[PDB]
Design a protein around this nucleic acid. Structure first.
Ligand SMILES: Nc1nc2c(ncn2[C@@H]2O[C@H](COP(=O)(O)OP(=O)(O)NP(=O)(O)O)[C@@H](O)[C@H]2O)c(=O)[nH]1
Ligand SMILES: [Mg+2]
Ligand SMILES: [Mg+2]
Ligand SMILES: [Mg+2]
Ligand SMILES: [Mg+2]
Ligand SMILES: [Mg+2]
Ligand SMILES: [Mg+2]
Ligand SMILES: [Mg+2]
Ligand SMILES: [Mg+2]
Ligand SMILES: [Mg+2]
Ligand SMILES: [Mg+2]
Ligand SMILES: [Mg+2]
Ligand SMILES: [Mg+2]
Ligand SMILES: [Mg+2]
Ligand SMILES: [Mg+2]
Ligand SMILES: [Mg+2]
Ligand SMILES: [Mg+2]
Ligand SMILES: [Mg+2]
Ligand SMILES: [Mg+2]
Ligand SMILES: [Mg+2]
Ligand SMILES: [Mg+2]
Ligand SMILES: [Mg+2]
Ligand SMILES: [Mg+2]
Ligand SMILES: [Mg+2]
Ligand SMILES: [Mg+2]
Ligand SMILES: [Mg+2]
Ligand SMILES: [Mg+2]
Ligand SMILES: [Mg+2]
Ligand SMILES: [Mg+2]
Ligand SMILES: [Mg+2]
Ligand SMILES: [Mg+2]
Ligand SMILES: [Mg+2]
Ligand SMILES: [Mg+2]
Ligand SMILES: [Mg+2]
Ligand SMILES: [Mg+2]
Ligand SMILES: [Mg+2]
Ligand SMILES: [Mg+2]
Ligand SMILES: [Mg+2]
Ligand SMILES: [Mg+2]
Ligand SMILES: [Mg+2]
Ligand SMILES: [Mg+2]
Ligand SMILES: [Mg+2]
Ligand SMILES: [Mg+2]
Ligand SMILES: [Mg+2]
Ligand SMILES: [Mg+2]
Ligand SMILES: [Mg+2]
Ligand SMILES: [Mg+2]
Ligand SMILES: [Zn+2]
Lengths: 129, 123, 314
RNA sequence: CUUACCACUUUGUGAUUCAUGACUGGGGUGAAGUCGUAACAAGGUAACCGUAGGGGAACCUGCGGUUGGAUCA
RNA sequence: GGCCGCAAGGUUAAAACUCAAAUGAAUUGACGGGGGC
RNA sequence: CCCGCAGAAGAAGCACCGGCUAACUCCGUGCCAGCAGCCGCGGUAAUACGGAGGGUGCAAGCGUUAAUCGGAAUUACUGGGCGUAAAGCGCACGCAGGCGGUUUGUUAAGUCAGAUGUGAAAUCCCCGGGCUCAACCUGGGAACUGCAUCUGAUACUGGCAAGCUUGAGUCUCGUAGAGGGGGGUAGAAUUCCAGGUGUAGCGGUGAAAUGCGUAGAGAUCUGGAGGAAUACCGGUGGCGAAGGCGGCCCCCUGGACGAAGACUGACGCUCAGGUGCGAAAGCGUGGGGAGCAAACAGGAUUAGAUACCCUGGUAGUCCACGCCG
RNA sequence: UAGCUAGUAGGUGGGGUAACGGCUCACCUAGGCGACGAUCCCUAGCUGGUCUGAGAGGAUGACCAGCCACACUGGAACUGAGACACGGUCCAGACUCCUACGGGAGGCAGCAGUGGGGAAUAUUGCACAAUGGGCGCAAGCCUGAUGCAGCCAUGCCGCGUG
């Protein structure tokens, strides 16, 4: 059964980039909305929108700067089988800081950069490059 | 595979089997030759290998190789054995220290004398 | 040195990696062989040397350096292996047959052809006559006489009852005799009876089951005859086929055929149905043993079946 | 002087362990012996799996199964 | 050894010892009591 | 520690040199003697064995053995795999356990932040200092990645409460199906028995033989008895968790799928142990036994045929109930 | 190696301890532990640390430092602030030693040293001069701790053999 929606969203994005789709659609979620907001802020994804009220759906517009996928690598790090929590100092750096690691801190969901600049540690949702 | 499986049972490493069990991690041992006999090697090699079966101090009985040309070993000889392995001799995993308290050095050996207990020729 | 001065010796028996060698003094020892030696069988005469006799209060393995040139030798062709010798320096072979394991006028003929090609004097013995009834004895003798009618020494002996050995003993004295034949025919038991070896030491003897007997003796061992000479126990054999021998050498092997060579109008007379084949009519009037003629033909046609292999036997 | 606790010990026994061991079962390695050649090509009766019976030996036969089998408009 | 089985045996399951290989796919050739022209 | 005296005067060995791996030639030998960490060498010019010369490395040491870690991602947390190389239980249900859709509220257990206390000294590291240098000793610092307590943070996981319907399940209406269990029945065919006709062979093989037939075989017709299996349909077809399931009909019964609508409201996934099902062969008891057929009997072939082939043929094959797994 | 446990797990009361407590006893309750591995079996002193490793880890606990346990084997207590006491006591056992056969004596796992085992590991040395410690007002006495020396290429570092 579906036991992790976040990895599902990540793999939907990945397979959409591989199949060169233009827009993907997940069953939305507050957490899914927050992660999508991060990737729109970081210029990873062009835009996102939520429709419906009883069964809301999130829709994402994938980017392709040279026709090649803008997000060339994305992977869930803290999975349900094994959670991952990092303290502020030991927060990771994706591609030596060229990429972005999304972390949920006590002050919401933010990039590793914003987190350690705010001095806050959290669960590492995933790595986006 | 799954972390849960590793938690239910951790990864058990592979302990190494010592190829010289009769040594008991001792660099050398002392034994008495109960029998000296000539054996034959594996198919690529043809020879009459001089080996001796030795009853060790710690109760173990093993067959040991005798290096160099010729030996003075006989029955009831108190020799010293060392670790090692002979490829073409199946079941022989020990050498004899030439020059160790019963076995003399090799006669007229001139090179690699220390490997056969041959004192430096007076010159 | 760890070894004694080299000396001449006989090969009492061969066991793969190492053989049994008797020195001129008459003491037998297990002795290794040098890899340069290629062939070494029972009866061979070798130069060897024993090891210094001080190890565990017993003797150490000797080394055999070389073998002397064989005088005679008994060989047998082996598919996948070519012709291989069983025993060398032999003087006489004794074809040992027995009624119970198998009666084979065909194996006896193959052996006769072989020994005729090897110039070795043969002798036919038929073992276990104790099993046959008196009528059956008269039913086996009137075809065992087939060979004694061409001079072959034919004897009938019962190893279990030691019956009629005595002429066999006489014929065995002062010669070198290899006991050959199919497995189960009684070659080991016959040797036990004749040699009268100590009860503690006897050759392995298992009884035959159903159609054919086991292969108990898997070796060839020399034994010193009580009166004089030597015998050799050999392992039983199944097929003594002769593809190595040329087809003409088979016509020569049948001794009852020289009486008719050059009497066939066709010079290249295959003698089967070619017109004017002298031995054809010879066997028509009973001069030749019909069974011998048919055996000759069938072993010839057998050579055609076993010529399929491209291996060489020279 | 007595009573309680109690180390040692003695039996009746049980369990367990070590050393040795009569007498054996199979195994392994060497291999230049012996008997046949079991498999590899359709290996000359396709091999193999489970099971049962048989046989000096590799093996043979029955039952079901597989292709990890060739040939076959 | 345990458990199971009436039994045949099944399941769980070592170690001593021994070798430098064992193996999978594919390549070129050679061979087939394999086919085709 | 310093000064003085004499004299090069008192002081160099060990391993290796085929590749890995820096270093090569002669002689002896001739699958012998021997070497060898691994591949490996030696049978007449051996750079691999022994000796010599030459060279390479290290040096008051040098080698060998033992032992540990590494290289080894070769137990893979960092950081491995399972179609054929080792590896998916035969299949299913299912307790414990692991994990868990979506919204709101609360809690602060996990988690994060801060603070405090502590984490002996030595040792490790850094900047210095002292032994003529170094080893060594030593000052200060760093570190001791840990633990504990307290105060907060509430995004995520957990707990609590209230929901929601998208997961899961129920209902209504139908469809297809060798799904399963039980009981009847049918038509071919094999064999057997009895009878009718009637002659001399039948049967079998590559060829034969064994075998059956003059009491009449085989052939053909009629009647009967019994057992087992369901040509054609038939399929790259269907059904079942798997093993498996094939004439027709009846009785009982499981699952799947489709349309529309309602209903419940996370009730879910997986599953160590456990339970159940589970081809063929096999075992127990009792029936049944047509055909087939291990074992066995026989005839051929063959050295033999203990096999393949042929003539027979028992267990078994079938049924009931257990067992086997 | 799947069950183990009856002072067993609790309670009340008494006793006992420097101190809480089944620490002990009487009675009462019938619990307690265990698949988050009890019990049983084998092995083992623990740590700071040491070796290796880029790191995570791996191996390990020789020297030095902290803790623990033991002092021929088994048991017990006394004395004392502190012991169930290495060079104290009692008993029992084994062994060794003395014997007048009546009975007695002993404990190097302190420093040297001997035999034995082993491939293998050193002197039956000097001094309390220094630092510690015991006693003493002190002087001072004692200290095989310690400071030094001896032996060993066992290791590291340095130098020479021109
Ligand atoms: N009835 C009977 N049996 C006999 C007689 N002689 C020997 N036997 C038996 O037949 C068997 C023969 O075995 P064996 O002698 O080993 O046979 P082999 O012919 O020597 N050859 P192999 O060794 O290969 O079997 C034994 O059981 C033996 O005792 C005899 O005269 N009569
Ligand atoms: Mg052969
Ligand atoms: Mg025999
Ligand atoms: Mg061929
Ligand atoms: Mg074959
Ligand atoms: Mg075949
Ligand atoms: Mg059979
Ligand atoms: Mg199947
Ligand atoms: Mg080089
Ligand atoms: Mg060469
Ligand atoms: Mg040369
Ligand atoms: Mg050399
Ligand atoms: Mg040199
Ligand atoms: Mg590793
Ligand atoms: Mg792998
Ligand atoms: Mg395989
Ligand atoms: Mg496999
Ligand atoms: Mg499966
Ligand atoms: Mg959730
Ligand atoms: Mg849960
Ligand atoms: Mg904190
Ligand atoms: Mg510290
Ligand atoms: Mg300095
Ligand atoms: Mg919550
Ligand atoms: Mg509702
Ligand atoms: Mg299970
Ligand atoms: Mg069945
Ligand atoms: Mg039955
Ligand atoms: Mg029955
Ligand atoms: Mg048949
Ligand atoms: Mg026959
Ligand atoms: Mg039924
Ligand atoms: Mg109380
Ligand atoms: Mg009180
Ligand atoms: Mg211990
Ligand atoms: Mg590493
Ligand atoms: Mg430890
Ligand atoms: Mg010590
Ligand atoms: Mg002692
Ligand atoms: Mg007191
Ligand atoms: Mg104490
Ligand atoms: Mg004391
Ligand atoms: Mg003492
Ligand atoms: Mg001492
Ligand atoms: Mg003082
Ligand atoms: Mg004193
Ligand atoms: Mg020194
Ligand atoms: Zn003619």
């Amino acid at each position: 059964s579906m036991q992790d929606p976040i990895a599902d969203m990540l793999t939907r994005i990945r397979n959409g980039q591989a199949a060169n789709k233009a827009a993907v659609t997940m069953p939305s979620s507050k957490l899914k909305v927050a992660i999508a907001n991060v990737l729109k802020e970081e210029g990873f994804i062009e835009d996102f929108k939520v429709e419906g009220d009883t069964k809301p759906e999130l829709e994402l517009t994938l980017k392709y700067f040279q026709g090649k996928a803008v997000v060339e690598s994305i992977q869930r790090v803290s999975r349900p089988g094994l959670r991952i929590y990092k303290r502020k100092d030991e927060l990771p750096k994706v591609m030596a800081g060229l990429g972005i690691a999304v972390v949920s801190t006590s002050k919401g969901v933010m990039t590793d950069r914003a987190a350690r600049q705010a001095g806050l540690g959290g669960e590492i949702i995933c790595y986006v490059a | 595979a799954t972390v849960n499986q590793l938690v239910r049972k951790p990864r058990a490493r592979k302990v190494a089997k010592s190829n010289v069990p009769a040594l008991e991690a001792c660099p050398q041992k002392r034994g008495v030759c109960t029998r000296v006999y000539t054996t034959t090697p594996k198919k690529p090699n043809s020879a009459l290998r001089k080996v001796c079966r030795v009853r060790l101090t710690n109760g173990f009985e093993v067959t040991s190789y005798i290096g160099g040309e010729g030996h003075n070993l006989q029955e009831h000889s108190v020799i010293l054995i060392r670790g090692g392995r002979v490829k073409d001799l199946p079941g022989v995993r020990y050498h004899t220290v030439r020059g160790a308290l019963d076995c003399s050095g090799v006669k007229d050996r001139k090179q690699a004398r220390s490997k056969y207990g041959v004192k430096r020729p007076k010159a | 040195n760890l070894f004694g001065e080299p000396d001449e010796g006989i090969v009492i028996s061969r066991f793969g990696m190492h053989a049994d060698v008797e020195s001129a003094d008459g003491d037998v020892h297990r002795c290794n062989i040098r890899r340069t030696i290629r062939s070494l069988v029972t009866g061979d005469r070798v130069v060897w040397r024993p090891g210094k006799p001080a190890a565990e209060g017993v003797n150490v393995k000797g080394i055999v350096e070389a073998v002397h040139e064989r005088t005679s030798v008994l060989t047998r062709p082996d598919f996948y292996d070519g012709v291989k010798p069983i025993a060398a320096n032999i003087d006489q072979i004794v074809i040992v047959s027995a009624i119970l394991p198998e009666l084979s006028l065909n194996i006896i003929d193959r052996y006769l052809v072989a020994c005729e090609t090897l110039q070795i004097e043969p002798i036919i013995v038929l073992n276990k006559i104790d099993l046959l009834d008196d009528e059956g004895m008269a039913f086996v003798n009137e075809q065992m006489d087939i060979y004694r009618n061409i001079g072959y020494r034919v004897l009938m002996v019962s190893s279990h009852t030691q019956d009629g050995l005595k002429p066999l003993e006489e014929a065995l004295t002062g010669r070198i005799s290899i006991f050959a034949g199919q497995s189960g025919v009684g070659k080991s038991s016959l040797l036990n009876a004749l040699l009268g070896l100590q009860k503690e030491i006897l050759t392995n003897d298992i009884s035959d089951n159903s159609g054919l007997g086991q292969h108990t003796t898997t070796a060839a061992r020399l034994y010193h005859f009580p009166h004089g000479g030597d015998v050799i126990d050999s392992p039983g054999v199944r097929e003594f086929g002769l593809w190595h021998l040329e087809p003409e050498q088979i016509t020569q092997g049948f001794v009852e055929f020289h009486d008719y060579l050059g009497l066939c109008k066709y010079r290249d007379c295959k003698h089967d149905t070619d017109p004017g084949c002298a031995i054809r009519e010879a066997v028509e009037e009973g001069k030749i043993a019909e069974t011998r003629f048919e055996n000759y033909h069938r072993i010839l046609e057998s050579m055609a079946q076993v010529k399929t292999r491209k291996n060489f036997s020279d």
